C-alpha cells in the first residue's frame, strides 16, 4: 500500500558507523589531549581550571571623553603630597 518505488531514502551523512573523527582529518587535536597515549600510560597530569596556564608568568596566584593626562597629573599631585 505504502510501497512507493519513487520514494528513495539516502544514507545519512556523515555515517555514524564510520570513524567520524578521521572523516575530516580531525585526529591531531584529539591525539593531543587524548586520555592516554598509544601505550595506555598517562601523558600529563589533569586538572580543572586555567590557573596553570599563567604559572610561567611572574606572580603569586595563590587564590583564583576621558582625559588621561589630567588623571595622570592628579595622581602625580596626590603622590607628591
Amino acid at each position: 500500500y505504502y510501497v512507493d518505488p519513487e520514494t528513495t531514502y539516502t544514507y545519512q551523512q556523515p555515517n555514524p558507523l564510520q570513524d567520524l573523527i578521521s572523516v575530516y582529518g580531525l585526529d591531531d587535536i584529539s591525539r593531543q589531549v587524548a586520555r592516554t597515549n598509544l601505550d595506555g600510560t598517562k601523558a600529563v597530569k589533569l586538572r580543572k581550571s586555567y590557573k596553570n596556564q599563567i604559572a610561567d608568568l611572574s606572580g603569586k596566584f595563590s587564590t583564583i571623553n576621558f582625559d588621561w593626562d589630567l588623571c595622570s597629573s592628579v595622581l602625580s599631585q596626590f603622590e607628591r603630597s
Partner: protein
C-alpha cells in the same frame, strides 16, 4: 590547499603577536604595581610612574584597535567553560570527562545501530520465510532503508 595553509599561518602569526602584546601589557602592569607598592615619592619616581601609566594606556589602546580590525583574522567560549576555569587548576579534567561522555554516547550509538541492523535483518528473513508472497517488497524495503 595552499590558501588554507596561508590563512592558518597568518592567523597563527596574528595570535602570536596578540599574545606577545598582552604579555607585555601584563608585565607592564606588574611593574606598575611594584612601583606603586614601593613608591618613594621622589619627582623622578613620579615622572616614571606617569610614563608607565601613559605606556600602559597606549598599549591598551593599540591592543583594542588592532583586535577590532574587521580585516584581521581574529574575527567559541561557552559560559560553562568560564565557570569551570574558575577553580585554580590546569584545564584537563573537564575535557577528559566530557570526551569520555562523548565516547560513551558514540559507543551507545554504534551498539544500537548494530542491534537495529540485526533486528531488521532477522525480521526480513523471517517475513520472507513464513510469507514468501511478501518477499519482494521486503527487499525493496531494505532498498528503501539502506
Amino acid at each position: 590547499m595552499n590558501g588554507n595553509s596561508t590563512n592558518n599561518e597568518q592567523l597563527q602569526q596574528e595570535l602570536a603577536t596578540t599574545q606577545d602584546q598582552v604579555a607585555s601589557i601584563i608585565e607592564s602592569f606588574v611593574e606598575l604595581g611594584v612601583s606603586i607598592y614601593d613608591f618613594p615619592g621622589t619627582p623622578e619616581a613620579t615622572k616614571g610612574m606617569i610614563t608607565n601609566l601613559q605606556r600602559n594606556v597606549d598599549r591598551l589602546y593599540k591592543l583594542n584597535v588592532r583586535s577590532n580590525d574587521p580585516q584581521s583574522s581574529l574575527s567559541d567560549i561557552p559560559l560553562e567553560v568560564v565557570q569551570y576555569i574558575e577553580d585554580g587548576r590546569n584545564p584537563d579534567i573537564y575535557t577528559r570527562e566530557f570526551v569520555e561522555a562523548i565516547r560513551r554516547s558514540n559507543q551507545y550509538q554504534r551498539g544500537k545501530m548494530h542491534g537495529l541492523k540485526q533486528l531488521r535483518d532477522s525480521l526480513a528473513d523471517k517475513i520472507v520465510d513464513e510469507f514468501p508472497e511478501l518477499k519482494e517488497p521486503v527487499e525493496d524495503i531494505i532498498k528503501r532503508t539502506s
